[PDB]
């Protein structure tokens, strides 16, 4: 499946991520690509042999902007570093 946080078990590599098609090219022997800090940035589709990038799903910290309990009980929430599309 592509573009949905999913559990990915390309043979030999187990991870949770959003699997998207990628432009970087692996040499024929290479299976899973890796990036600085040693994380599994990309995997090669075993059956279709295409480079499928792996990205971790959305994470961040909610913060509550409150006028003050005395002034009001209405609140706002800033979901830090997330894209409005994935908030709900």
């Amino acid at each position: 499946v592509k573009n949905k946080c999913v559990n990915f078990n390309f043979n030999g590599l187990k991870g949770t991520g959003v699997l998207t098609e990628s432009n970087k090219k692996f040499l024929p022997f290479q299976q899973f690509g890796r990036d600085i800090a040693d994380t599994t940035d990309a995997v090669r589709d075993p059956q279709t042999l295409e480079i499928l990038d792996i990205t971790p799903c959305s994470f961040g910290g909610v913060s509550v902007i409150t006028p003050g309990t005395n002034t009001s009980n209405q609140v706002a929430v800033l979901y830090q570093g997330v894209n409005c599309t994935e908030v709900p």
């Binding site: 040499l27 299976q31 899973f32 690509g33």
Partner: protein, 140 residues
């Protein structure tokens, strides 16, 4: 027993993981840089006619290519790092060795050439954007 120095040769891709523009330090058996080799755990066998290798404590890599060991049958300068069993190779009219094949040994023979023998060492291998090990430094 004529001796020839091996300059920046015997480097083989350590593992399948692709790394792009990343310098990775790997501690693995390798032929130390600038090491003398006899010219007639692993060997950087190379041939400038050459046919097959007989290796046993047995396996005969006769060259379809009549590989035999249990036995398994498969399909200028030539470089053939052999390790225990992983065989790497390159054919060239710094060059790194792909993992040409891995097969599920005390002495080496040949039938129809320079040989060198690897040791445990640490090296810094510079992968380029297309994940090719362009250069390396022996750190000792």
């Amino acid at each position: 027993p004529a001796y020839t120095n091996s300059f920046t040769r015997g480097v083989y891709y350590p593992d399948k993981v692709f790394r792009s523009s990343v310098l990775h330090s790997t501690q693995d058996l390798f032929l130390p840089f600038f090491s003398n080799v006899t010219w007639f755990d692993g060997v950087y066998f190379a041939s400038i006619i050459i046919r097959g290798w007989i290796f046993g404590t047995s396996l005969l890599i006769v060259n379809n290519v009549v590989i035999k060991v249990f036995e398994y049958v498969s399909q200028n300068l030539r470089e053939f790092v052999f390790k225990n069993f992983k065989i790497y190779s390159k054919h060239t009219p710094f060059s790194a060795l792909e993992p040409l094949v891995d097969l599920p040994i005390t002495r080496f023979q040949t039938l129809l050439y320079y040989v060198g023998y690897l040791q445990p060492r640490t090296f810094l291998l510079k992968y380029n954007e297309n994940g090719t090990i362009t250069d390396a430094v022996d750190c000792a």
